[PDB]
Write an enzyme that holds these catalytic residues in place. Structure first.
Site: not given
Ligand SMILES: O=C1/C(=C/c2c[nH]c3ccccc23)Oc2c1ccc(O)c2CN1CCCCCC1
Length: 261
Positions: A8-10, A12-13, A15, A85, A124
């Site tokens: 669904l997304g990714s 640098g934390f 995926s 989103d 955030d």
């Protein structure tokens, strides 16, 4: 135990994959041990934070379970279906109508108050970290990965979204929780009614002068400029935001869904 669907997304934390419990829709979030900065009680802070907030119902994404692995943690999260989103939804439909922005903004404020009531500060808040359950018309907050335990003293860390960060962070690398949260809520409501964020650059943030690019009612401009006051202590409390004349006669998530979605 889960059936991994597509990515669904990714970042640098990690995926995040779509998934099914073996029958509920879930989202499966993989985070690299290398890539976590803040730990809690040992787990990624997100897990601490989500357990604290994940009691009961609210407008926060629920943590259903989690797992540890040699090099990564895996979080199992609620997934509404269908979902979009808010960054996407704004990209697609342009600036929102005031009525819809009021409904969405209220739900965000209820979600943010709930996190604070639970001792959690998100750090955030922004359109990308908000999901819309399109059938029910409910907003849910996601990604507590830059969050912290709520406290009353100064914060000296920030790994949130820069353009959503307040002037006191830009200038002094210090802020307090609630007031920096109210600033990001100011950026967010501007984003909803204008279709984009008000400030791109450090100096426009420090300057804090708000230019409206779209027709926006005066009460909304007033609310937005109030959340975006340069001095933290000049910003409204959550209560003051919710008692703001622009916030009156909010629609139910369900009416919001019937009319607008
Ligand atoms: O913590 C995260 C999360 C949780 C979810 C819980 N239910 C869901 C359902 C769909 C998508 C994500 C979720 O989704 C995350 C998280 C962190 C970073 C990230 O890039 C995503 C994926 N995102 C979908 C694409 C828009 C940009 C950000 C949101």
């Amino acid at each position: 135990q889960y059936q991994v669907g597509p990515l669904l997304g990714s970042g640098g934390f990690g995926s995040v994959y779509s998934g099914i419990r073996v029958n509920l829709p879930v989202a499966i979030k993989h985070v690299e041990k290398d890539r976590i900065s803040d730990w809690g009680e040992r787990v990624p802070m997100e897990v601490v934070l989500l357990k604290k907030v994940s009691s009961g119902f609210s407008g926060v994404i629920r943590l259903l379970d989690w797992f540890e692995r040699p090099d990564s943690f895996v979080l199992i999260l609620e997934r509404p279906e269908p979902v979009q989103d808010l960054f996407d939804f704004i990209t697609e439909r342009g600036a929102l109508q005031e009525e819809l922005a009021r409904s969405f903004f209220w739900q965000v404020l209820e979600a943010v108050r709930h996190c604070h009531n639970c001792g959690v500060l998100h750090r955030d808040i922004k359109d990308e970290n908000i999901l819309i359950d399109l059938n029910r018309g409910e907003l849910k907050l996601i990604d507590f990965g830059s969050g912290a335990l709520l406290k009353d003293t100064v914060y000296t860390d920030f790994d949130g979204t820069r353009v959503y960060s307040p002037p006191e962070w830009i200038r002094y690398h210090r802020y307090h929780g609630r007031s920096a949260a109210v600033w990001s809520l100011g950026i967010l409501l501007y984003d909803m009614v204008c279709g984009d964020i008000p400030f791109e650059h450090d100096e426009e943030i420090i300057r804090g002068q708000v230019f409206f690019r779209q027709r926006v009612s005066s009460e909304c401009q007033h609310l937005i400029r109030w959340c975006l006051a340069l001095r933290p202590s000049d910003r409204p409390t959550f209560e003051e935001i919710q008692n703001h004349p622009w916030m009156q006669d909010v629609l139910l998530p369900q009416e919001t869904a019937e009319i607008h979605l």
